[PDB]
């Protein structure tokens, strides 16, 4: 029973040991560094009054949605510092938010175990709820739109699910995690996705048939964030052990470890740039370090927030990055 | 400058801002009480996911977030409740003979809550529930089965006061927060009266720390 599973754990290990002939540092030691990245705050969004927990950009890289704990979903015009919409929420405990690729829908969720879909382009002119999804038993952590008809959600009951907006019922359930699943990331081709959980392990899933393909380990603490590379063949995880790590979907092992001796606090959000050269990680020491993802060097510090950084995200064209924090301020950096 | 439609877009954004501050003072006027501790007895007589109960008493609007249905890890959502006024913590008294010891599991929960980073400034209200059933249980069984260092008489007054002193002994940074201890009465409605009296002292200190006096 258990002895048959234990011997094949080494069968994963020795094939992975023979797979690793070199490291990423031994490949990229002969390239130039990106340099000390200094970038300032261009816009500051001051409308919120509680902690910001989630932020998602738009497809046109101008509108963004921010979720906070006072029960307000606010759509921001980041060019002119305007409030396009203000959506009151049924439950004030919100931990995730999402933006549709078509721009017609937004999502939110949290401790209420309910994912709400709000319609933005209705005839009446006011943002109203379109579909209420409630099939989970654990707290919602991350939700990402695939299109106007299906959405993938992460919950705290060690499961992920694939939904259908029109029917209102889930079509696929992704099971196999043992810890609380904390994040999601959708691939550029939108065929497969990852999920970081609290078992110090992130697993890659297929959207179509609904099975886990690969399992990635290496962290000694629980994972709070995940994000694919812009290539779609790689992703990165941010955990509570002050350590970011990079995985490859083909190599199926660790590549680089982004950590420093003076960093002790955990990581809340991790995102990549447009070219994938810069990894941006939001720590809990009131700042945000910019990690050069091919050199494991801190190439820039974003230290303009009073409280801890909880959410960050980079535009589709790479023009700007917005950082959310618990001091009720969104700051667009460029 | 701006076009004819950008002036109306900024004016629309200003009209939203007067509704955000209107709702901000509406939410800050009401008082939030996190409800921890393993609970259901205290809420039925005063009136999946997080269940919040809204009620008013003496022109003050209370809300109690019952998180007993959350079977997940408490560490990932206990920082969402750092902006509360008082944690209402419920301890049963008739589970000291029942068994891991059920009485000792409450002190492990009490140690984690008081030593949190996010609950240093926030006061904690302590409720000792089922005080009537403890009186019959202390006559048939001594309290020394839980504590081998138990001393004093085995009467109801000495045993109930002996449990209380260790609960306040687990409190650290005693200058910041004050633990209010009450014994629940099922017949009387004095339990909701103790909540209103305890929350009045916290918001006076909260009003005095806004100006800088206390």
């Amino acid at each position, epitope marked *: 029973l258990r002895q048959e599973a234990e011997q094949l754990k080494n069968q994963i290990r020795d094939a992975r040991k023979a797979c690793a002939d070199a490291t990423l540092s031994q490949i990229t030691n002969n390239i130039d560094p990106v340099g000390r990245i200094q970038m300032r705050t261009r816009r500051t969004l001051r409308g919120h009054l509680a902690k910001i927990y989630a932020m998602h950009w738009g497809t046109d890289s101008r509108l963004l949605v921010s979720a906070s704990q006072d029960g307000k979903l606010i759509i921001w015009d980041s060019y002119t510092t305007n409030k396009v919409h203000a959506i009151p929420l049924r439950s004030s405990w919100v931990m995730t938010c999402a933006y549709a690729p078509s721009g017609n829908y937004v999502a939110c969720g949290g401790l209420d175990n309910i994912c709400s879909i709000y319609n933005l382009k209705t005839r009446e002119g006011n943002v109203r709820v379109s579909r209420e999804l409630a099939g989970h038993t654990g707290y919602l952590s991350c939700c990402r739109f695939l299109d106007d008809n299906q959405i993938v959600t992460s919950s705290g009951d060690t499961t992920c699910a694939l939904w259908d907006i029109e029917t209102g019922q889930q079509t696929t359930t992704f099971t196999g995690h043992t810890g609380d699943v904390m994040s999601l990331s959708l691939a550029p081709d939108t065929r497969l996705f990852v999920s970081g959980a609290c078992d110090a392990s992130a697993k890659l899933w297929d959207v179509r048939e609904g099975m886990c393909r690969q399992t990635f380990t290496g962290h000694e603490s629980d994972i709070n964030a995940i994000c694919f590379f812009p290539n779609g063949n790689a992703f990165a995880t941010g955990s509570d052990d002050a350590t970011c790590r990079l995985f490859d979907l083909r190599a199926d092992q660790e590549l680089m470890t982004y950590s420093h001796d003076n960093i002790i606090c955990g990581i809340t959000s991790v995102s990549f740039s447009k070219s994938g050269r810069l990894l941006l990680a939001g720590y809990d020491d009131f700042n945000c370090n910019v990690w050069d993802a091919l050199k494991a060097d801190r190439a820039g510090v974003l230290a303009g927030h009073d409280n801890r950084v909880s959410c960050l995200g980079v535009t589709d064209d790479g023009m700007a990055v917005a950082t959310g924090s618990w001091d009720s301020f969104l700051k667009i950096w460029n | 400058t701006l076009s004819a439609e950008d002036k109306a877009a900024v004016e*629309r954004s200003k009209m939203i801002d007067r509704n955000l501050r209107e709702d901000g003072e509406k939410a800050a006027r009401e008082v939030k009480l996190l409800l921890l501790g393993a609970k259901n007895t205290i809420v039925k007589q005063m009136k999946t996911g997080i269940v919040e109960t809204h009620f008013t008493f003496k022109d003050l609007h209370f809300k109690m977030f019952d998180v007993g249905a959350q079977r997940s890890e408490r560490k990932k959502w206990i920082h969402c409740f750092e902006g509360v006024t008082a944690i209402i913590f419920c301890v049963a008294l008739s589970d000291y003979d029942l068994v891991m010891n059920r009485m000792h599991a409450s002190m492990k929960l009490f140690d984690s809550i008081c030593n949190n980073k996010w609950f240093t400034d926030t006061s904690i209200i302590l409720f000792l529930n089922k005080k009537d059933l403890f009186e019959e249980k202390i006559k048939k069984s001594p309290l020394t089965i839980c504590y081998p260092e138990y001393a004093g008489s085995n009467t109801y007054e000495e045993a109930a006061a002996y449990i209380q002193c260790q609960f306040e002994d687990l409190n650290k940074r005693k200058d910041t927060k004050e633990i209010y201890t009450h014994f629940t009465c099922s017949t009387d409605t004095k339990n909701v009266q103790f909540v209103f009296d305890a929350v009045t002292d916290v918001i006076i200190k909260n009003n005095l720390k806004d100006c800088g006096l206390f």
Partner: single-chain antibody
Amino acid sequence: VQLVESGGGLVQPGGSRKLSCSASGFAFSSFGMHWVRQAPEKGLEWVAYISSGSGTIYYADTVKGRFTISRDDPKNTLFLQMTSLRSEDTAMYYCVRSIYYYGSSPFDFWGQGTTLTGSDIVMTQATSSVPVTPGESVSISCRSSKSLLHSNGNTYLYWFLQRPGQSPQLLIYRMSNLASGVPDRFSGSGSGTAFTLTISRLEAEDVGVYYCMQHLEYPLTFGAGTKLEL
């Protein structure tokens, strides 16, 4: 969503009449409102405008002072007060709703319409009437005096369709944009000065009068009118 304008009828030049409309089916307090006047066998004329929450009120220069416009958000009723009436003010009055944010489509709905018995950009139509057989793609030209291209990068020109016997309908609200409920045969392109609307297929519902409107600066001025015939 409908707008039914009350009031109207016979009135002496010395008399004064109050015009009001009933708004239903939409969040009336979030929408800015307009009054647009259509003279008999002439082009459309803009009268007044209220922003959301009665913040900014603008008037046409010909009716400034004599006309008062007000709204009541709990009543969901928009009022126009007319104190001095000439022989020029005998015309049909329409009510238009519009909301202004990023990516918005203002002037998207028009009322049914009641009857009553110096430095402005001038909109001119090069053709008075072009009889078009169905199936032949045509372009309707609108010529402006001042360039409508703004610094933020969007030209403010609006295309309207006057079907015979009904209210105006918004087809295109900005250049390289299309309104909701309009088929894909309507396509528009713009330049610095000259603007055109290029339709491809023609049906019985596409016949009427086409009006180009500007929204760069108050007062808003409409086009002369490009009639189509069958």
